[PDB]
Amino acid sequence: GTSQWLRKTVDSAAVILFSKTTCPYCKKVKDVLAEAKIKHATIELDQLSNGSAIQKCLASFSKIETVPQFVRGKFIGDSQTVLKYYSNDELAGIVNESKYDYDLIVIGGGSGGLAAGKEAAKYGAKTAVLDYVEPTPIGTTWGLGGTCVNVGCIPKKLMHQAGLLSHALEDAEHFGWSLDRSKISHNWSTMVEGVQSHIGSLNWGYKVALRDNQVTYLNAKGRLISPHEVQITDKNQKVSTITGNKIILATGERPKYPEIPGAVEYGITSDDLFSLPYFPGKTLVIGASYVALECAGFLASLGGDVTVMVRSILLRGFDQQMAEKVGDYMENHGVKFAKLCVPDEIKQLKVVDTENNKPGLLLVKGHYTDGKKFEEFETVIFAVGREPQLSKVLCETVGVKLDKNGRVVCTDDEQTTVSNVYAIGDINAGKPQLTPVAIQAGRYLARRLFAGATELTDYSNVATTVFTPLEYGACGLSEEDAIEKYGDKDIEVYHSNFKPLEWTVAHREDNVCYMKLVCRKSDNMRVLGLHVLGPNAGEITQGYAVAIKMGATKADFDRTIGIHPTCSETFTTLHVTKKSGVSPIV
Amino acid sequence: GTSQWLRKTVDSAAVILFSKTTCPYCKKVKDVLAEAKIKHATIELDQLSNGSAIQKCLASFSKIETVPQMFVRGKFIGDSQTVLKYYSNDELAGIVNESKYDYDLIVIGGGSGGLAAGKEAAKYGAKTAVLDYVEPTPIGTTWGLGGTCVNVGCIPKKLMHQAGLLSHALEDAEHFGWSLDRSKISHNWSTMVEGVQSHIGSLNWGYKVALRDNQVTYLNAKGRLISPHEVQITDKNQKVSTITGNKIILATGERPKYPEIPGAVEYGITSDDLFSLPYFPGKTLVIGASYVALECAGFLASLGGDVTVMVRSILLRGFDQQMAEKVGDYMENHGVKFAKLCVPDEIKQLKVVDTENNKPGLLLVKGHYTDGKKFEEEFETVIFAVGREPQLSKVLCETVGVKLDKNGRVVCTDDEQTTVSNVYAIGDINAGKPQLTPVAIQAGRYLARRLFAGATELTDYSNVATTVFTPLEYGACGLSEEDAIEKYGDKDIEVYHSNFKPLEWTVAHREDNVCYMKLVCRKSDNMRVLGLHVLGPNAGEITQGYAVAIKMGATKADFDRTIGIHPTCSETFTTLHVTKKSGVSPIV
Ligand SMILES: Cc1cc2nc3c(=O)[nH]c(=O)nc-3n(C[C@H](O)[C@H](O)[C@H](O)COP(=O)(O)OP(=O)(O)OC[C@H]3O[C@@H](n4cnc5c(N)ncnc54)[C@H](O)[C@@H]3O)c2cc1C
Ligand SMILES: Cc1cc2nc3c(=O)[nH]c(=O)nc-3n(C[C@H](O)[C@H](O)[C@H](O)COP(=O)(O)OP(=O)(O)OC[C@H]3O[C@@H](n4cnc5c(N)ncnc54)[C@H](O)[C@@H]3O)c2cc1C
Ligand SMILES: OC1CN(C(c2ccccc2)c2ccccc2)C1
Ligand SMILES: OC1CN(C(c2ccccc2)c2ccccc2)C1
């Protein structure tokens, strides 16, 4: 038991020191390692639940039981032995002795891979991270940091914010400011400049941060040819093979395209939208996911003429009453919808004018589910899902098992069917596809491999926010999911409309914002899911995700007092139930 | 045991029907009561844990143990047949109105807690009256039903706070690509006051209509407890009379103090006046350092005023002082001036307020610093924010026996009972309780439930979250750092902290390291979160949800294992790691 942990820890750690805080002979070793620039993990025996057993158990490797004791599985010595290697100039060569080039190779430099790399490096692991950005069909490309940094959460929430500031210009007049919203316009390329300027500063920050943790950054495409061999390819095409003890796969996903004529040739995806040199103009967004809705939302707030093509429903997998309230708000505020509709081909009427910086022109043809026809836009953005391309990363012969969708099947500690290879982030099968999830898995995984830790990532009840023009925050089950799992008779739902105080003087709507709490009667009225639609929904929801992790019930919400003038306080006084039939309005 | 609960409930309730859900004889009696428009509390016995024992105890009053049993003001009325005999004989309505006094409940004070108590008492059939009156300010300002928050507190102040934030929203819009020129935009104070006052007026009317449609008598009259059941009311027409009630709830709030210096009451104003002021204040001196004074000073600067705050000693006494100082440093860097360690001596009139052209006067303010050097500057407006106090002398005849602490607040047990057994107190006049509007609503709604419905839930007053609405907002829940260190000793306290920068501030070119958060934790108790603090945008919305986890005893581990929501400020709480003992820098 304790036997198996210690044998595991001593085998994968690069440089580890077993120690005590009060021990003086250990501080002498720490000081030598500190002085010689030797990074290492450290286990202070005197603060562990079974430090006595561990100390006795260490003798099985070192034939001693005292407490200043390891490099890559090999016992090195006590303080006397280590000082002697130090004095005689032998110490640096033993700590670099390795069967492989790196203790860890990370394939993919995004939210999870950068986070796993930086954490391993802190415990002495010799570490390389690989990153390469295959261009889009028109050639768009970007720098280190992954999908969120460059073409995901960071540029889309900045663009969300450009769009919110438009209603702030509307609201300012009613609070007494002299401006006239009706004679202000928005300049797209000015906005893209500021957004890209911030993205480039993150590109630079990550490069600076790997340099300062002594992580090798290879800007190269990687391929696992064998359990410890990674084939890399240069920007000059030069092919080479590096070796690593532990491999972490963290290569993420890219957007899909429908198999129709003109899709790849004349349409774009979100990959291209966030650095586009011209304003998209009259835009058709094809899709109904959060990417499609979020992008269609801010393009509308920035003045554009915007249509969304919906195959079946909005936001599949999320609570469908909230999805529809989200949709009704957008449809009431500009965004147009072609419902139960699908595209059949894109034809080109004008080519993109690179000179004068202008979009092209396109004819879009399709049909509705009843057969009726759909038939002009300047930009077509496809947002019809995302997928990994592991055939380009992972030679079949290696042995890494995949599920039917192309994602990696992993144990609950991120390990693949090949004992030294792990996977994190979007390509980990059945996990929430979110940046904060990728970062926590990567950091905890790196501590287990090189520092003796045991903590797992908890993937249950992870909160979300959809940054549509009115935001929608969620934590836990949807309403339909709770009923499907426990029966309607066992589910109680408390809900209420509300109106932000900032909307009163601005003459905004009375009962569009909405929140609800999905509970379980038989389990002391346990909160199964939380849903809020309104401004700052992400800030509202986060704090509640902690109490749900702790098993919060309706009583825990009742007995907590609200903070006044806020929207979030409405959760602390909810009382109208859906079965009561009472109206939720204010 | 259970028996003395049942007698407190039966003796106190107005109309109460002991029933069972499945019982068909009960459902017949419910509908008779619903038809004749007779409201009542209902205690379903098959949905309480030990209702079988209670059935036995009901015999102590009614000599039966059958299910349908109705009581009116402590008297057993009848079972199913007897209440149907009363109905068809034109007798039910006389028995249900049989009362020793005019009302079951008199609420003195129609503010946050009083209106809430009255509304919930009327639900369960209590004949309720709620008195409200607004003594005018020295310059004669006056307002309508609702209390201090609705008319001259949390509601107009956050709206003016909001007008102030839109200034920086207008600045940021240029950087996000909008064409406006912030330079050429100014503010109009009177246009703003009209909108805020319009929304207030709509709230005055909503409360009158809520009270009408709950069957609560609203008397616009000043009330005075003369005996334990007798309240004396004075009209707007100066007319005096005497009503009586079984239970009395005192909920009369507070008003702003003035310092005893020449000129103050004559030529100064307070918060009661600032939110309906017909003219813009102009160059303004705010005296004091509480959340009222900083919040008001903050939006006047944001609106474009020339503003000075006179601090006697420290900012935000009683709060976390590292946080208080970060608040004050932000303000000083964005145009609020402070006169530090300074106190006023007199206010001299130089010019009278021009009511006709709608312009302020001119004042001279003279005071002195602790170093002996003198203060002398002219100000168009001077606002005192130097505390708030109750005036129970005007409410409470000394002969009644309601005991008060040295400050003038009402001593109460943990269910709000005064030293006179039928009189309670809620809100700002309850001694030792957080003086906050949500607290006064929960106190009010829970007390009414206990008196007229047989509920037992108490108000929990510990760890009540707050938010100070300065230009950069400050949210807090729990103990401040110096309080935890004092209570447990410094070696038992660990503090995790971090600077942050909202994503919205990146393209807007705002500062990198002003926003800040910290968790104050107790080592020897599983790293228990003793207090949470955040300085930043939307601090109210950030803090609220964590108040639930803290009520539940959250630890640092519980914050670690919860995952963030990305693009948010609030997610920085889920990955804190730098400790103060460590001495590592918290910057970004
Ligand atoms: C438009 C959009 C908006 C989003 N908004 C949010 C949001 O608000 N909040 C949120 O939590 N999540 C959001 N997400 C999801 C978030 O981007 C992902 O969950 C996150 O990026 C997953 O991180 P990862 O490390 O698994 O993958 P990635 O960040 O994509 O990292 C993979 C990296 O590896 C590179 N790579 C691929 N193949 C190879 C190879 N063979 N060799 C070397 N390098 C390779 C890729 O080019 C890339 O740089 C959004 C996603 C999109 C598309
Ligand atoms: C400027 C300011 C800003 C504030 N901002 C906030 C904030 O953001 N959040 C927050 O939670 N709290 C805030 N507060 C505090 C909040 O206003 C109070 O905690 C709350 O109003 C207390 O409610 P109450 O029912 O105890 O008293 P009140 O609201 O004052 O109600 C008492 C009422 O009774 C009336 N009355 C008095 N004497 C008599 C009498 N003899 N007969 C009849 N009627 C009488 C009074 O005129 C008044 O209408 C603020 C306070 C101020 C001054
Ligand atoms: O024809 C049906 C209308 N449906 C969507 C819809 C509703 C409102 C606005 C836009 C779109 C929808 C369906 C289901 C969940 C949420 C929204 C497609
Ligand atoms: O912004 C400045 C810092 N603020 C004061 C302060 C605020 C909180 C705690 C202590 C001190 C102050 C400083 C020095 C002398 C007197 C008061 C106002």
3-state secondary structure B238-275: CCEEEEEEEEEEECCCCEECCCCCCCHHHHCECHHHHC
Q: How many CA atoms lie within 13 A of B301 on its CB side?
A: 23
Q: Write out the residue range of the structural domain in which residue A128 sits.
A: 102-132+219-253+388-451
Tokens of B189: 């104070």
Atom of ligand 4 nearest to the CA of B324: 8
- Sheet of strand A472-476: strand arrangement: A464-466, A472-476, A526-533, A513-520, A491-498
Q: Are strands A526-533 and A472-476 parallel, antiparallel or unpaired?
A: antiparallel
H/E element, B16 = strand B15-19
Question: Is residue A536 less than 8 Å (CB to CB) from chain B?
Answer: yes
Tokens of B423: 């009189």
- Measured CA to CA, the distance from residue B292 to residue B317 in angstroms comes to 12
Amino acid in the structure at residue B111: G
Atom of ligand 1 nearest to the CA of B567: 8
- Measured CA to CA, the distance from residue A236 to residue A220 in angstroms comes to 10
**A272 and A341 part of one domain:** yes
**Beta-carbon contacts below 8 Å between A and B:** 253
Domain boundary among A333, A350, A384: A384
- Measured CA to CA, the distance from residue B470 to residue B295 in angstroms comes to 5
Is residue A318 within 6 Å of ligand 3 at its C-beta? no
B229 is in an annotated binding site: no
Phi, psi of A35 (to 5 degrees): -65, -35
B391 is in an annotated binding site: yes
User: Cβ of B438 and A565 within 8 Å?
Assistant: no
Active site residue B566: yes
> What's the CATH code of the domain at A54?
3.40.30.10
**B436 and B394 part of one domain:** yes
Helix axes A111-121, A188-212, angle to 10 degrees: 20
| Of B149, B159, B538, Cβ closest to residue A536 | B538
| Of A158, A473, A562, Cβ closest to residue B438 | A562
φ/ψ region of B263 (left if φ > 0, alpha if ψ in -120 to 50, else beta) reads left
Q: Which ligand sits closest to the CA of A106?
A: 1
Q: Give DSSP secondary structure letters for B113-169.
A: HHHHHHHHHHHTT--EEEE---PPPTT-----TT-HHHHHSHHHHHHHHHHHHHHHH
Which residue shows structure tokens 């992972």?
Answer: A394
Phi, psi of B45 (to 5 degrees): -80, -30
Whether the CB-CB separation of B59 and B65 falls below 8 Å is answered with yes
Question: Is residue B547 less than 8 Å (CB to CB) from chain A?
Answer: yes
Nearest C-alpha neighbor of A164 from the set B542, B537, B456? B537
Is residue B478 within 6 Å of ligand 2 at its C-beta? no
B397 is in an annotated binding site: yes
Domain boundary among A68, A95, A122: A95
**CA triplet B415, B417, B421: central angle to 5 degrees?**
135
Question: Is residue A157 less than 8 Å (CB to CB) from chain B?
Answer: yes
Nearest C-alpha neighbor of A263 from the set A354, A380, A366, A389? A380
**B271 and B211 part of one domain:** no
Q: Any idea how long chain B is?
A: 588
Is residue B565 within 6 Å of ligand 1 at its C-beta? no
DSSP class of residue A353? B
**A273 and A362 part of one domain:** yes
Question: Is residue B170 less than 8 Å (CB to CB) from chain A?
Answer: yes
Nearest C-alpha neighbor of A213 from the set A120, A305, A144, A306? A120
Tokens of B386: 């130097």
H/E element, B542 = helix B539-551
Tokens of B431: 């001694």
> What's the CATH code of the domain at A531?
3.30.390.30
- B588: in domain: no
| Of B179, B558, B561, Cβ closest to residue A184 | B179
- Dihedral sign for Cα A116, A121, A125, A126, please: positive
- For testing contact with chain B, the best of A542, A573, A574, A586 (most B CBs within 10 A): A542
Whether the CB-CB separation of B197 and B391 falls below 8 Å is answered with no
Cα A111 to ligand 1 centroid, rounded to whole Å: 7
**B207 and B340 part of one domain:** no
Phi, psi of A259 (to 5 degrees): -85, 80
Which residue shows structure tokens 């790691």?
Answer: B577
- For testing contact with chain A, the best of B178, B185, B446 (most A CBs within 10 A): B178
**B511 and B485 part of one domain:** yes
- B463: in domain: no
Q: Which ligand sits closest to the CA of A407?
A: 1
H/E element, B207 = helix B189-214
Let me know how many helices (H) and strands (E) chain A has, helices first.
Answer: 17, 24
Cα A486 to ligand 4 centroid, rounded to whole Å: 57
Alpha helices by DSSP H, A137-255:
146-151, 153-174, 188-212
Maximal CA-CA distance, chain B: 86
**A106 and A62 part of one domain:** no
Which residue shows structure tokens 């309780």?
Answer: B433
Amino acid in the structure at residue A286: I
- Measured CA to CA, the distance from residue B270 to residue A104 in angstroms comes to 66
Whether the CB-CB separation of B33 and B17 falls below 8 Å is answered with yes
Whether the CB-CB separation of A155 and A140 falls below 8 Å is answered with no
Q: Hey, which residues 431-450 in chain A have their CB within 8 Å of chain B? A: 434-437, 439-440
Mutation pick for ligand 4 pocket among B286, B308, B313, B315 (CB with most ligand atoms within 8 Å): B315
- B460: in domain: no
Give the experimental resolution in Å.
2.5
**A124 and A240 part of one domain:** yes
Nearest C-alpha neighbor of B562 from the set A440, A431, A546? A546
Whether the CB-CB separation of B427 and B421 falls below 8 Å is answered with no
Domain boundary among A384, A413, A428: A384
Question: Is residue A161 less than 8 Å (CB to CB) from chain B?
Answer: yes
Within 10 Å of residue A575's Cβ, how many Cβ atoms? 12
Tokens of B506: 């990146």
Is residue A472 within 6 Å of ligand 3 at its C-beta? no
| Of B166, B198, B559, Cβ closest to residue A546 | B559
Query: Which residues, 6+ apart, have CB-to-CB distance to B140 below 8 Å?
Result: none
| Of B169, B191, B439, Cβ closest to residue A176 | B191
- Dihedral sign for Cα B173, B176, B177, B183, please: positive
Whether the CB-CB separation of B113 and B443 falls below 8 Å is answered with yes
- B316: in domain: yes
Let me know if A404 is exposed, middle or buried by CB neighbors in 10 A (0-12, 13-18, 19+): exposed
- Dihedral sign for Cα B406, B407, B411, B414, please: negative
Query: Which residues, 6+ apart, have CB-to-CB distance to A457 below 8 Å?
Result: A414, A437, A440, A441, A444, A445
**B109 and B247 part of one domain:** yes
Whether the CB-CB separation of B180 and B173 falls below 8 Å is answered with yes
Whether the CB-CB separation of B301 and B334 falls below 8 Å is answered with yes
Query: Which residues, 6+ apart, have CB-to-CB distance to B503 below 8 Å?
Result: A154, A157, A158, A161, B567
DSSP class of residue A567? S
Tokens of B141: 């300002």
Q: Which ligand sits closest to the CA of B221?
A: 2
> What's the CATH code of the domain at B440?
3.50.50.60
Within 10 Å of residue A264's Cβ, how many Cβ atoms? 17
Q: Any idea how long chain A is?
A: 586
Q: Give DSSP secondary structure letters for A52-67.
A: HHHHHHHHHHHS--SS
Query: Which residues, 6+ apart, have CB-to-CB distance to B465 below 8 Å?
Result: A561, A563, B475, B476, B477, B543, B544, B546, B547
- Measured CA to CA, the distance from residue A302 to residue A285 in angstroms comes to 15
> 3-state class of A572 per DSSP?
helix
Tokens of A92: 């640096």
User: Cβ of A169 and B180 within 8 Å?
Assistant: yes
Nearest C-alpha neighbor of B435 from the set B400, B473, B409? B409
Tokens of A158: 């900045």
Which residue shows structure tokens 């709509």?
Answer: B202
User: Cβ of A473 and B565 within 8 Å?
Assistant: yes
Residues of chain B neighbouring A176 (CB-CB closer than 8 A): 163, 187-192, 195, 303
- Measured CA to CA, the distance from residue A399 to residue A418 in angstroms comes to 6
**B268 and B233 part of one domain:** no
Q: Catalytic residue among A40, A167, A495, A564, which?
A: A564
Tell me the C-alpha to C-alpha distance, in Å, between residue B331 and each of B75, B232, B295, B369: 63, 48, 10, 21
Q: What is the 3-state composition of chain A as percent helix, strand, coil, each rounded to the nearest 5?
A: 35, 25, 40
Break sites following residues in chain A (C–N > 2.5 A): 69, 375
- A522: in domain: yes
**B380 and B393 part of one domain:** no
Q: Give DSSP secondary structure letters for B413-424.
A: -TT-B-SSTTEE
H/E element, A532 = strand A526-533
Whether the CB-CB separation of B376 and B364 falls below 8 Å is answered with yes
Nearest C-alpha neighbor of B510 from the set A475, A278, A582, A161? A161
Tokens of A451: 């520092």
User: Cβ of B195 and A185 within 8 Å?
Assistant: no
Residues of chain A neighbouring B169 (CB-CB closer than 8 A): 165, 168-169, 172
Q: Which ligand sits closest to the CA of A327?
A: 3
Distance from CA of A462 to the nearest CA of B (A): 6
B472 is in an annotated binding site: no
- Measured CA to CA, the distance from residue B369 to residue B372 in angstroms comes to 5
- Measured CA to CA, the distance from residue B400 to residue B405 in angstroms comes to 16
Residues of chain B neighbouring A191 (CB-CB closer than 8 A): 176-177
- Measured CA to CA, the distance from residue A144 to residue A133 in angstroms comes to 9
**B292 and B335 part of one domain:** yes
Number of domains chain B is built from: 4
**Experimentally, how was this structure solved?**
X-ray
Query: Which residues, 6+ apart, have CB-to-CB distance to A37 below 8 Å?
Result: none
Tell me the C-alpha to C-alpha distance, in Å, between residue A98 and each of A71, A72, B62, B271, B426: 9, 7, 90, 73, 73
- Measured CA to CA, the distance from residue A541 to residue A465 in angstroms comes to 8
- A207: in domain: no
H/E element, B218 = strand B216-219
- A240: in domain: yes
- A298: in domain: yes
Q: Which residue of A has its CA nearest to B198?
A: A505
Which residue shows structure tokens 């809020």?
Answer: A532
Whether the CB-CB separation of B104 and B117 falls below 8 Å is answered with no
- Measured CA to CA, the distance from residue A132 to residue A389 in angstroms comes to 14
Helix axes A2-12, A51-62, angle to 10 degrees: 50
Q: What is the 3-state composition of chain B as percent helix, strand, coil, each rounded to the nearest 5?
A: 40, 25, 40
Q: Are strands B466-468 and A341-350 parallel, antiparallel or unpaired?
A: unpaired
